[PDB]
Homo-oligomer: A and B are copies of this chain.
Amino acid sequence: ANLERTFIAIKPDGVQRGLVGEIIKRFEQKGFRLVAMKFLRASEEHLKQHYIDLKDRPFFPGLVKYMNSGPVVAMVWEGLNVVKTGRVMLGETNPADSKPGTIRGDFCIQVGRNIIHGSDSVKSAEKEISLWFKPEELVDYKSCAHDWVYE
């Protein structure tokens, strides 16, 4: 259970507004383990694949353009219930509903510029991880505080 992983991506507005370090620190101080990280401008084709479920929504063309309009930080994090807990830490998808203390609650305002993405389930995490990273980009190491984080 402690080996669960999620995909977290800082979107272009999070990069542009200078929020990368603050976001990583939230995951680090919680006790989760950084498995993978890269910085890139995601191609339109890649983003169409990421967002394939939405390909018919009216806002899809604009979503893909915005997500391609600057670089993103793509990450994988590991730990117990990291998918669900990761989502709690992000806050609600819509920042208007996100509580103070959460990433979106603290740092952004509108649903179209909501700074971050996290996997919504284990099954979507495994799909997003295979889409965004090569197997060799997932680094295997053990946190020095593992036994103080986990029974």
Residue numbers of A with Cβ under 8 A of B are 12-13, 15-32, 34, 36-41, 62, 66, 70-71, 73, 79-81, 85, 88-89, 91, 96, 99-103, 105-110, 112-113, 137, 139, 141, 143-145, 147-151
Contact = CB atoms under 8 A, between A and B. Distances in A.
Q: How many subunits of this chain does the assembly comprise? A: 6
A113 to B, nearest CB: 6
Contacts of A137: 38-40
B109 A141 contact: no
Given A21-B24, A37-B37, 17 more contacts: A15-B34, A16-B145, A17-B145, A19-B28, A21-B22, A21-B23, A21-B29, A29-B107, A30-B106, A36-B39, A37-B73, A39-B137, A41-B141, A66-B151, A89-B100, A91-B100, A99-B101
